Structures are given as C-alpha cells and as structure tokens.
Point group: C3
C-alpha cells in the first residue's frame, strides 16, 4: 500500500536531518593563557564533564579542575605573579562559576538571574 | 502486521537519537576580564538572545548589552584605564560585531566575507 | 485506520523536535586581541572548517589560518612585540592545537589524553 510507502519516505527524510545534526557535533573547548612562558589552560566539555589540560613550558598534563558541564568559557588575570582563573560551566540553563585563587577550585558568586 | 511493527521500532530508534542530541544542549557563554580588581563580563546566548552579567568587585549585575545570537565570543583590551570590548554574536551564518568604547554598544565593521 | 493515524502524529511530533534543534544551530566563533591598536583575530567554525578574519586597525581581511573543525577556541600572548597564538580546533572528540609564532601555522604538542 501507498500508506506504508509514504511513512517509509517520511522516516527516511528524518534520518537525513538527524545525520546532519550529528555531523556538527563535537567536544567544546575554552582556552586561557598568562605570562610569557606561557602557562596555558585548556578546558574541554565532553559528554557532560569538563576537564582541564595544562602547559607551563615543559609538556602537557591534566589539571585539578573536574566539574560537570556541556558548555565552558574561561577568563583569567594576574595579580602580580599570582594567577586567578574563572571558569563558567553551563548545563541546561544553569551556569556555575568556578574559582582558582592559588589552592583549590571553589564555587563562585556568579548568577545569571 | 509486521509492516506496522517495523515502523514502530523505526520511530523508537529516532527517539533515542533525538534524546541524545537534546542531552548535550545548554546555554553558551563567553567571558572576558580586565585589570586587577578585576572587572569581569560574562555573555550568555540563551534561546536566541545574548545577555551580559558584570562584576567590578562588589557583586554581580546585569549590563547594558542585549542583542540576538545563538553563539557568542568576546575579546577586550585596555587603552590606559579605558576598556574596549568586542562581542561577536552569530545567528545562522551571520556574525555581527558589537563595540563598547565608553558609552554605548554600536555595530562594528566586522564581516565574515 | 487508527494504526496509520497514530504514526502520522508520531512523525509530526518528531518534526517539532528536529525543528527546535535546528533553530539553535549557528556558526561558532572565538576571538582574541593584543596591544592597543588593537590587532584582533576572529576564528569561525562553519560547516566543518575554521577560517580566520583579521583586524590591525585598517579594515578586516582574511588570515592564513584554514583548518578543519566544528568547534574552536583561541588564546594568545605577547613576547615583547611578537604575538603568539594558539588555536584549538575540535572535530568529534579530537582536538588539534595550531600554533602561530611569526611565520606559519604549525601543529602543536597538545593532546587531551
Ligand atoms: O599546575 C596545575 C594547576 O594549575 C592551576 O593554575 C590550575 O589550572 C589548577 O587547576 C591546576 O591543577
Ligand atoms: O573570590 C571569589 C569571587 O571572586 C570574584 O573575582 C568573582 O569571580 C566572584 O564571582 C567570586 O565569587
Ligand atoms: O558597568 C556596566 C557596563 O560595563 C561596561 O564595561 C559594559 O560591559 C556595559 O555593557 C555595562 O552595562
Ligand atoms: O570603533 C569601531 C571599530 O573598532 C575596531 O576596533 C574594530 O572592532 C572595528 O571592527 C570596529 O568597527
Ligand atoms: O597579518 C595576517 C596574519 O596575522 C597573524 O597574526 C596570524 O593571524 C596569521 O594567520 C594572519 O594571516
Ligand atoms: O612552539 C610549539 C609549542 O608551543 C607551546 O606554547 C605550546 O602551545 C605547545 O603545545 C606547542 O607545541
């Protein structure tokens, strides 16, 4: 019947659309750096978790940052030689700020409101 | 019939794929900062609109920036004490540059070409 | 029959969900800047390719950077007057670092591990 043949091309069209959406998919990164060496921190949202990779001039290694998020952005600044980093990790519509200030990642005051 | 049973598992498979796509979805953020206080600006693309949240050392508040976009990136620089911000808001394939230079957001010269 | 009418509303619901996913889609940008002029570089992931647009104070032009990627982030730093840029281009779960250090884009040591 042409009733079943119609829906068989309907699902075929939906497979073309879903495959186009899946084509664009990838991990999401954010990067910051400081000084002249330099130091570089690269944050990667992958499968709902954000991890950190670090460079201080002598090879790449995994940093202490490990939090949930499907999206990430980062900024940092120097107070003298001391580095301060702010990572904004988002899941759904909730965005949590994470703060490095010398020894450990803490939850920041940021809200979207 | 096994004709109807085939399409009933076809749509069931498409529900698994669409749910996987929706799982990764979230708001998209960009951040910049300047000075030593510091000042921080956080831009959030949510539901086709980009809004701005601000920190100058004494709590978070909503900034003047409000434009359309599903994606956002930002950079900024200091000319002395004066801050200049450039926000690149994208919808589809169109990317508009927005310029802060001391009093108001203006449309920048940027084009993708 | 109500067997065919059921699947005709099933596919209708999947069209609403796919259209919501396609609504959020856009090009993805990252930006960096340096100095006081300033110089600005804007990277755009579009249809699996990342291109670069440049500003050094006298109009926008297309830069040498051209690599594959569905996601992009960037950071840069000055060693004196010399600019160094690091672009992290991601496809699927693979993230390649690209390095500008004065004459040409080279593949960087970065790995996600
Ligand atoms: O030296 C490694 C450490 O560097 C700091 O700047 C932060 O990025 C930490 O998360 C990281 O573990
Ligand atoms: O020290 C913690 C505080 O640091 C500031 O720079 C901001 O990032 C605040 O949102 C944060 O709570
Ligand atoms: O002080 C608030 C103002 O700060 C400026 O740097 C910009 O971010 C404006 O959009 C904002 O309204
Ligand atoms: O002052 C306006 C101009 O400022 C420059 O720094 C660039 O961002 C231009 O694209 C913009 O049009
Ligand atoms: O002046 C143009 C050149 O500027 C450099 O800083 C890099 O961004 C190159 O990719 C670009 O071609
Ligand atoms: O000069 C090449 C090297 O430069 C460093 O700053 C890092 O970005 C390395 O990952 C890269 O391989």
């Amino acid at each position: 019947s042409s009733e079943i043949a119609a829906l068989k091309q309907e699902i075929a069209a939906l497979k073309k659309e879903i495959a186009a959406l899946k084509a664009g998919a990838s991990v999401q990164t954010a990067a910051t750096s400081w000084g002249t060496v330099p130091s570089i921190r690269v944050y990667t949202a992958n499968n709902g978790k954000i991890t950190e990779r670090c460079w201080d001039g002598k090879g790449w290694y995994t940093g202490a940052f490990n939090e949930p998020g499907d999206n990430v952005s980062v900024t940092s600044w120097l107070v003298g030689s001391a580095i301060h980093i702010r990572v904004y990790a988002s899941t759904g519509t909730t965005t949590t700020e994470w703060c490095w200030d010398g020894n450990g990642w803490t939850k920041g005051a940021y809200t979207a409101t």
